[PDB]
């Protein structure tokens, strides 16, 4: 004979009060199973008595990490103090129904007047909490703010991540998406620089013949203004652009003096210098990505970084998909991702598999094993020269 | 939906009151046909599948206005035999199946508590309040309503019961803690005006337990002081205020709230020659606070808000008023 029952869910814990309790001899009967199916014949059994939601996801996380371990929380003790009639079991008891046996023992030890029935032992309270878990969306919907699906989703993620310690040694997404960004904007830098090179050599065609390194081309067409306004070493720029006094600026200016290209307009020069500012901003962002990605690679997988070099190492990581996939692959699959060249390739694949599994399966990895394997590859590079 | 067969009982229950009203000369027969049709439409709306707390409240308001109309008409036609007990019983029935259907609606719970308090039902009010607190334990408004009505009744032990369970539950926001300190010091003022309690150590204990709560900010302690600073006409009020100031000074040394309580401390029970004396003391504290190393924009916004509170009162001198304006404008 049950009086109340606890029921804990991801939004909070609610205790129901049973009226017209379930038949215990005909629990395996088809009419009683159909009654437990239909909400119109199970809501006559249960009536919602109290509800306690969590204050925050931190409290829900503490709630699971206490309840699954077995120990009851202080706010569950609080809500039971509030909802149950205060007795001690000398002349009248209260039967509570709980899902877990350790929680049953602890609630009975905290409240001596409450006899708890566990769902793991008693079939009546098992079927009754089973029906409440069946209809739990509709029994709470008058005070169910939102849904239960996203709450269970986020709470299962928080519980699993707290059990696993996931975020402290899962770090590879920054590396693989940084490789994707680096290649995409390297292509975009080269394409925008080719476009500004053609569309400014239409105006001043000596700059393509006399100046390479298209980033420095974008800088000199940012600083040069028009064809008419040239002077060599005016202020702050060309001395640290390139050689200053006797080598380059004179040649650019005599190229402007003998220059024959089409005269450009002010608004067209404005648009070309806007495109050059765009290209050099993307180049500055490329060097910021390269520095930050070298630092992140030295934080995540330093052995692969020292045996391969960080661009090709992080390319290999991104093509494998993750460090866990890279470590699970053997050395021949890492070959997939004359004779001496293939021999050194196989040896490098073996040592790169060893470096990948060492750098992955550490908590916070090291440097010296990659240093040892790079010394081993260097002494093999010395070894193949004797023959 | 068996709603016709379900509402048949409530109409057959409301029928003999209509028979009494027809056999008296109070409602005529066409008006009683209108009452029958309106109660029938209301019952078939109430017992419908897809219903709403506003629908339950519309039915409650109609039945209560019918009771008021019949009271006016009965006093006008000079009858004393007709009683309001059947109407109050059916209004309690509407409210009970209302809180059965929608227990998660505090508007309907508070309307139920307002109705049960208005027709003089104290024990029923306490039972409804217990059920509402069990369903909405995180609601500071319900907890303060329970505690304040138990203090208004005078059962201070029951008021403390409701308030201590409320402070056990509602620990995210300071609101119920401030209201509990307000109710305990109002009990202290009642114990003074009736002339332990001689020490008045309970708001100091409330502060000492509130020091470790998840809302414990300097703004929250300033809210504690802004609660405490009212009704200064007591005995241990200087003890409580001084303990709050030394707690805030030992914990948050250079906060603008702590400098604000350093400004506004010595004006506890002043209204009168002791008023501008303590004002000159507080303005010395304020000038030292303005020159001192604190976030001056935050402290100045606090002081211009308190100075709007100052400017809200009449009966002062114009030189003091214009020097408040002069010190206000350059902030």
């Amino acid at each position: 004979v049950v009086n109340f029952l606890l029921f804990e869910s991801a939004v909070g814990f609610s205790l129901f009060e049973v009226v017209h309790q379930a038949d215990t001899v005909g629990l395996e009967l088809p009419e009683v199973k159909d009654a437990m199916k239909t909400l119109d014949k199970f809501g006559k059994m249960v009536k919602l008595r109290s509800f306690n939601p969590w204050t925050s996801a931190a409290q829900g996380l503490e709630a699971i990490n206490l309840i699954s371990e077995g120990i009851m929380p202080e706010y569950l003790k609080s809500a039971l103090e509030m909802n149950l009639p205060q007795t001690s079991g000398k002349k009248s008891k209260v039967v509570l129904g709980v899902a877990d046996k350790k929680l049953a023992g602890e609630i009975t030890a905290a409240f001596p007047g409450v006899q708890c029935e566990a769902a793991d032992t008693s079939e009546v309270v098992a079927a009754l909490l089973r029906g409440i878990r069946t209809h739990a969306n509709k029994l709470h919907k008058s005070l169910q703010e939102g849904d239960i699906g996203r709450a269970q989703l986020g709470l299962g993620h928080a519980y699993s991540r707290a059990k696993v310690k996931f975020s402290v040694h899962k770090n590879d997404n920054h590396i693989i998406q940084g490789i994707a960004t680096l290649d995409a904007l390297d292509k975009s830098i080269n394409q925008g620089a080719m476009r500004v090179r053609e569309w400014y050599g239409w105006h001043f065609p000596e700059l393509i013949r006399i100046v390479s390194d298209n980033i420095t081309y974008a800088k000199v067409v940012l600083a040069i203004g028009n064809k008419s306004s040239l002077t060599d070493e005016s202020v702050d720029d060309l001395a640290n652009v390139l050689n200053q006094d006797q080598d380059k600026a004179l040649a650019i200016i005599q190229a402007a003096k003998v220059s024959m290209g089409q005269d450009i307009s002010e608004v067209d020069l404005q648009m070309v210098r806007d495109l050059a500012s765009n290209v050099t901003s993307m180049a500055d962002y490329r060097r910021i990505l390269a520095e930050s990605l070298d630092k992140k690679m030295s934080e995540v997988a330093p052995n692969l970084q020292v045996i391969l070099g960080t661009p090709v190492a992080a390319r290999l990581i991104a093509h494998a998909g993750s460090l866990t996939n890279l470590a699970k692959y053997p050395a021949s699959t890492l070959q997939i991702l004359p004779k001496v060249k293939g021999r050194i390739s196989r040896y490098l694949a073996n040592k790169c598999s060893i470096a990948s599994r060492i750098d992955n399966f550490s908590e916070k990895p090291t440097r010296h094993f990659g240093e040892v394997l790079r010394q081993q590859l260097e002494q093999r590079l010395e070894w193949y020269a004797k023959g | 939906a068996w709603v016709a067969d379900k509402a048949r009982f409530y109409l057959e229950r409301a029928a003999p009151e209509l028979r009494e009203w027809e056999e008296k000369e109070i409602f005529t027969k066409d008006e009683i046909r209108n009452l029958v049709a309106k109660r029938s439409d209301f019952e078939h709306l109430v017992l419908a599948p897809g219903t709403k707390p506003t629908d339950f409240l519309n039915y409650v308001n109609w039945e209560r206005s019918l009771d008021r109309l019949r009271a006016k008409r009965c006093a006008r036609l000079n009858i004393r035999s007709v009683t309001s007990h059947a109407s109050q019983a059916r209004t309690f029935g509407i409210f009970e199946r209302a809180v059965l259907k929608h227990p998660g609606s505090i508007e309907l719970w508070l309307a139920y508590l307002e109705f049960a308090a208005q027709v003089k039902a104290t024990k029923r009010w306490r039972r409804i309040m217990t059920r509402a607190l069990r369903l909405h334990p995180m609601n500071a408004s319900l907890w303060t309503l329970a505690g304040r009505r138990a203090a208004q009744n005078g059962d201070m032990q029951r008021a403390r019961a409701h308030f201590l369970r409320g402070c056990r539950f509602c620990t995210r926001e300071p609101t119920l803690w401030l209201e509990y300190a307000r109710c305990e010091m109002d009990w202290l003022a009642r114990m003074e005006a009736k002339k332990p309690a001689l020490s008045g150590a309970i708001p100091i204990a409330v502060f000492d337990v509130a020091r470790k709560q998840p809302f414990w900010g300097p703004a929250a302690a300033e809210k504690f002081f802004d609660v405490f600073a009212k009704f200064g006409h007591l005995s241990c009020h200087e003890r409580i205020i001084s303990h709050v100031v030394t707690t805030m000074q030992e914990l948050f040394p250079n906060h603008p709230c702590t400098w604000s309580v350093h400004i506004r401390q010595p004006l506890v029970g002043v209204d009168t020659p002791a008023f501008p004396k303590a004002l000159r003391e507080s303005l010395a504290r304020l000038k030292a606070a303005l020159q001192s190393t604190t976030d001056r924009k935050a402290l100045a916004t606090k002081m211009v808000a308190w100075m709007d509170g100052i400017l809200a009162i009449e009966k002062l001198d114009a030189a003091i008023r214009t020097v408040l304006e002069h010190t206000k404008r350059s902030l």
């Binding site: - | 039972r127 402070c167 056990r168 309970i202 204990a205």
Partner: peptide, 28 residues
């Protein structure tokens, strides 16, 4: 009877607040 919320005692006192308030009212 679980009709109303009974006044707390030292048996049904949970937190440090209720312990300290009951200690003060016991010393009263």
């Amino acid at each position: 009877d679980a009709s109303e919320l009974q006044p707390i005692t030292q048996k049904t006192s949970g937190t440090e607040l209720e312990q300290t308030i009951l200690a003060i009212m016991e010393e009263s």
